[PDB]
């Protein structure tokens, strides 16, 4: 079909740009002092993210901060290098845009555009659950995002509402590329968030891009049910439900939605949607998605069901409060060798 084809072309042309950047990455585009540090927007793995303000242009950004030494003790050097290298080469509407990246004696810094609407996570917990139509508008942008990433041979491997921000127009922006990796072929690292881990993973069998599609499965359920499919208090109990191959859907889920889900939440890779002949196409054409005008989604033409409230530039209202911590820079360089190409 004509519609595909157009996709294929766009995608081809997109691969061309990314390679260009993938092969000749940006480095040292700024310095710490060019920004006023305002407030911690959230935390994560071994880093923190802060609202910052660009002294020279007046813009606000979100700056992610990694302690070199910490990354080293936690064996995350390759992941960190990968994160930055991938983030700087990508370009897609639903991905956060990296502005600058730089380093110093003790840290690694990534400056991205500020997405003020907050984590999907918080709206989600507050609201309880999203309506099938609301959930679909979100899922759709994730489907197109993964279609993009996967085409570039990238595996994103940490989908979760805590990593999806809502912008000014109600659209999503995926963040946290810390486990993103470019591989042709199989991978084996043990990483992700327990509730979202594909079975092959927990089973450490070696895996591919299909883990992303299982994740999208979890995400969709969570969104619509207001709780993940496999929940417990201790990770291990969680791992046992994921492998057991048993899901129970709520009574309010449409039949189309459970159909999609039982396909996505498929234990057998051979049978999992996204990892077969028609690829992503089996998802885009699913019945649940009959109403989605994928191109208009792409173009941000659809009306967002919910638009967060943004009161002023630098408004942090849509994010929780965190203990601020001092940023310390040694008058001594930490692990230069390890982070040379950063």
């Amino acid at each position: 079909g004509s519609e595909q084809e157009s996709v294929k072309e766009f995608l081809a042309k997109a691969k061309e740009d990314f390679l260009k950047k993938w092969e000749t990455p940006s480095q040292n585009t700024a310095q710490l002092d060019q920004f006023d540090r305002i407030k911690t927007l959230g935390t994560g793995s071994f880093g923190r993210v802060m609202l910052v303000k660009h002294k020279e242009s007046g813009n606000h950004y979100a700056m992610k901060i990694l302690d070199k030494q910490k990354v080293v003790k936690l064996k995350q050097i390759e992941h960190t290098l990968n994160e930055k290298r991938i983030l700087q080469a990508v370009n897609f509407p639903f991905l956060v845009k990296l502005e600058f990246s730089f380093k110093d004696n003790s840290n690694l810094y990534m400056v991205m555009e500020y997405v003020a609407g907050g984590e999907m996570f918080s709206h989600l917990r507050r609201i309880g659950r999203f309506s099938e139509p609301h959930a679909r508008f979100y899922a759709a942008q994730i489907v197109l995002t993964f279609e993009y990433l996967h085409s570039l041979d990238l595996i994103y491997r940490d989908l979760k509402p805590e990593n999806l921000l809502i912008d000014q127009q109600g659209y999503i922006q995926v963040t946290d590329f810390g486990f993103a990796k470019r591989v042709k072929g199989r991978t084996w690292t043990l990483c992700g968030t327990p509730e979202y881990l594909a079975p092959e993973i927990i089973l450490s069998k070696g895996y591919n891009k299909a883990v992303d599609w299982w994740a999208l499965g979890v995400l969709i359920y969570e969104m619509a049910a207001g709780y993940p499919p496999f929940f417990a208090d201790e990770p291990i109990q969680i791992y046992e439900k994921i492998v057991s191959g048993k899901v129970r859907f709520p009574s309010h889920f449409s039949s189309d939605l459970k159909d999609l889900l039982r396909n996505l939440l498929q234990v057998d890779l051979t049978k999992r949607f996204g990892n077969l002949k028609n690829g992503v196409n089996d998802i885009k054409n699913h019945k649940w998605f009959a109403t989605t005008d994928w191109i208009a989604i792409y173009q941000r033409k659809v009306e967002a069901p919910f638009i967060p409230k943004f009161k002023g530039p630098g408004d942090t209202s849509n994010f929780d409060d965190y203990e601020e911590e001092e940023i310390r820079v040694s008058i001594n360089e930490k692990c230069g060798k390890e982070f040379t190409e950063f």
Binding site: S45, L74, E162, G178, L190, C191, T193, P194, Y227, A232
Partner: peptide, 20 residues
């Protein structure tokens, strides 16, 4: 309800990413 079991569980807050 399952929802109620969710709310009383110890994993309703932000979940961190694991590694090894």
């Amino acid at each position: 309800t399952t929802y109620a079991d969710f709310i009383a569980s110890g994993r309703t807050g932000r979940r961190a990413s694991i590694h090894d």
